[PDB]
Write an enzyme that holds these catalytic residues in place. Structure first.
Site, PDB file in Angstrom:
ATOM      1  N   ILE A 101      45.193 -11.228 -39.691  1.00 54.96           N
ATOM      2  CA  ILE A 101      45.365 -11.821 -41.045  1.00 54.96           C
ATOM      3  C   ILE A 101      45.820 -12.975 -40.845  1.00 54.96           C
ATOM      4  O   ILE A 101      47.226 -13.144 -40.497  1.00 54.96           O
ATOM      5  CB  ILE A 101      46.010 -10.877 -41.963  1.00 54.96           C
ATOM      6  CG1 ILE A 101      45.052  -9.756 -42.196  1.00 54.96           C
ATOM      7  CG2 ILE A 101      46.177 -11.501 -43.387  1.00 54.96           C
ATOM      8  CD1 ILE A 101      43.678  -9.846 -42.619  1.00 54.96           C
ATOM      9  N   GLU A 109      44.689  -2.565 -38.988  1.00 53.18           N
ATOM     10  CA  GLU A 109      45.027  -1.710 -37.954  1.00 53.18           C
ATOM     11  C   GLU A 109      44.165  -0.395 -38.236  1.00 53.18           C
ATOM     12  O   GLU A 109      43.760   0.254 -37.166  1.00 53.18           O
ATOM     13  CB  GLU A 109      46.679  -1.191 -38.499  1.00 53.18           C
ATOM     14  CG  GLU A 109      47.836  -2.160 -38.429  1.00 53.18           C
ATOM     15  CD  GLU A 109      48.028  -2.764 -36.736  1.00 53.18           C
ATOM     16  OE1 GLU A 109      46.915  -2.260 -35.802  1.00 53.18           O
ATOM     17  OE2 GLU A 109      48.856  -3.201 -36.299  1.00 53.18           O
ATOM     18  N   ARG A 165      41.219  -1.048 -36.028  1.00 56.04           N
ATOM     19  CA  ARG A 165      41.726  -0.889 -34.625  1.00 56.04           C
ATOM     20  C   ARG A 165      41.549   0.299 -34.114  1.00 56.04           C
ATOM     21  O   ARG A 165      41.028   0.743 -33.192  1.00 56.04           O
ATOM     22  CB  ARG A 165      42.857  -1.707 -34.260  1.00 56.04           C
ATOM     23  CG  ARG A 165      42.668  -3.420 -34.487  1.00 56.04           C
ATOM     24  CD  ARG A 165      44.409  -3.788 -34.277  1.00 56.04           C
ATOM     25  NE  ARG A 165      44.391  -5.301 -34.306  1.00 56.04           N
ATOM     26  CZ  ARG A 165      45.210  -5.884 -35.135  1.00 56.04           C
ATOM     27  NH1 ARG A 165      46.073  -5.262 -35.849  1.00 56.04           N
ATOM     28  NH2 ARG A 165      45.133  -7.187 -34.941  1.00 56.04           N
TER      29      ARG A 165
HETATM   30  N1  AMP Z   1      49.023 -10.619 -39.547  1.00 56.55           N
HETATM   31  C1  AMP Z   1      48.610  -9.647 -38.742  1.00 56.55           C
HETATM   32  N2  AMP Z   1      47.185  -9.335 -38.709  1.00 56.55           N
HETATM   33  C2  AMP Z   1      46.884  -8.374 -38.203  1.00 56.55           C
HETATM   34  N3  AMP Z   1      47.565  -7.422 -37.408  1.00 56.55           N
HETATM   35  C3  AMP Z   1      48.908  -7.794 -37.344  1.00 56.55           C
HETATM   36  C4  AMP Z   1      49.063  -8.846 -38.003  1.00 56.55           C
HETATM   37  N4  AMP Z   1      50.795  -8.942 -37.692  1.00 56.55           N
HETATM   38  C5  AMP Z   1      51.063  -7.893 -36.982  1.00 56.55           C
HETATM   39  N5  AMP Z   1      49.809  -7.152 -36.559  1.00 56.55           N
HETATM   40  C6  AMP Z   1      49.873  -6.111 -35.696  1.00 56.55           C
HETATM   41  O1  AMP Z   1      51.380  -5.684 -35.200  1.00 56.55           O
HETATM   42  C7  AMP Z   1      51.632  -6.127 -33.694  1.00 56.55           C
HETATM   43  C8  AMP Z   1      52.707  -7.255 -33.599  1.00 56.55           C
HETATM   44  O2  AMP Z   1      53.404  -7.113 -32.439  1.00 56.55           O
HETATM   45  P1  AMP Z   1      54.761  -6.085 -32.369  1.00 56.55           P
HETATM   46  O3  AMP Z   1      55.769  -6.282 -33.467  1.00 56.55           O
HETATM   47  O4  AMP Z   1      55.421  -6.271 -31.185  1.00 56.55           O
HETATM   48  O5  AMP Z   1      54.070  -4.497 -32.463  1.00 56.55           O
HETATM   49  C9  AMP Z   1      50.207  -6.309 -33.166  1.00 56.55           C
HETATM   50  O6  AMP Z   1      49.870  -5.239 -32.511  1.00 56.55           O
HETATM   51  C10 AMP Z   1      49.287  -6.258 -34.487  1.00 56.55           C
HETATM   52  O7  AMP Z   1      48.084  -5.799 -34.143  1.00 56.55           O
END
Ligand code: AMP
Ligand code: NAG
EC number: 3.2.2.22
Length: 245
Positions: free
Chosen positions: A71, A160, A163
């Site tokens: 997003i 999420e 996925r």
């Molecule tokens: N704007 C976003 N849109 C979609 N998924 C996100 C977004 N921000 C974070 N995520 C998800 O959160 C994780 C970010 O890295 P982490 O904080 O280390 O878990 C990723 O695996 C993303 O699938």
């Protein structure tokens, strides 16, 4: 485009929306029967528009990168909002052109920076379909601190859930009552890039992960995923991030 209406929503309509969000993402092949997202898309075609309507029929349009289900930003009435990061800056060249003004949020769109802005980790923020109604309402008019929490709810109940089947099922359980995410919901969110990489590498390694991935299971117990016969690969994961990304 894809659309979801909270008015009249039930576990069935939400599950059909998430199936429809998955199907809106282009792929050329499947790896172990899972769609492999594209390495890249040029120009406007990179962005899916996701229309979300709150209980009261008020709406935002959410811009989603179809290569990684990220997003980037959203349109609320006459104002566009984008995360403070280069990919969302680029998105703003292609989507929400007619917006009267463009706000850059005072955070990037990654979990570490949204959690800092919200003042709470994901673990402590109830998610569900009511929480998504509340998130849409929050985003219709600007409030950067309130928006960070809303965006955390939005990401978890759309991207999420696209996925992972398990996360879709968790939000279905929360159709009428918000609850903080399960231990496994957090683990899978954090593990998607890793699992995507290992499942791609397993093609060329007889279905064996070059590097085992540690997850939390639906019982809250730590498990080591070593190969593609795991339920995480055969039923749970629904989309693979391309190893090029
Ligand atoms: N704007 C976003 N849109 C979609 N998924 C996100 C977004 N921000 C974070 N995520 C998800 O959160 C994780 C970010 O890295 P982490 O904080 O280390 O878990 C990723 O695996 C993303 O699938
Ligand atoms: C492959 O994974 C399955 C399911 O998780 C497990 O039962 C099996 O022990 C694994 N095989 C090896 C060789 O690790």
């Amino acid at each position: 485009d894809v659309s979801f209406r909270l008015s009249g929503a039930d576990p069935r309509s939400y599950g059909m929306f998430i199936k429809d969000l998955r199907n809106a993402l282009p792929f050329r092949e499947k790896v172990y029967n899972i769609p492999l997202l594209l390495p890249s898309v040029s120009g406007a075609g990179r962005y899916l528009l996701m229309h979300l309507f709150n209980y009261d029929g008020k709406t935002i349009t959410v811009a989603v990168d179809v290569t990684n289900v990220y997003i980037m930003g959203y349109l609320a009435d006459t104002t566009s909002y984008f995360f403070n990061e280069p990919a969302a800056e680029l998105a703003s060249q292609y989507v929400f052109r007619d917006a009267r003004r463009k706000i850059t949020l005072p955070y990037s769109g990654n979990y570490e920076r949204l959690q800092i802005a919200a003042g709470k980790p994901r673990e402590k923020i109830p998610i569900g379909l009511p929480a998504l109604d509340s998130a849409i309402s929050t985003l219709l008019h600007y409030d950067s601190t309130a928006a960070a929490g809303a965006l955390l709810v939005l990401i978890q109940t759309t991207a999420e859930a696209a996925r992972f089947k398990y996360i879709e099922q968790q939000i279905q359980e929360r159709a009428y009552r918000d609850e903080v995410p399960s231990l496994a919901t957090i683990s899978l969110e954090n593990s998607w890039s890793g699992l995507s990489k290992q499942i791609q590498l397993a093609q060329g390694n007889n279905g064996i992960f070059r590097t085992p991935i540690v997850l939390v299971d639906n019982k809250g117990n730590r498990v080591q995923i070593t190969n593609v016969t795991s339920k995480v690969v055969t039923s749970n994961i629904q989309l693979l991030l391309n190893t090029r990304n």
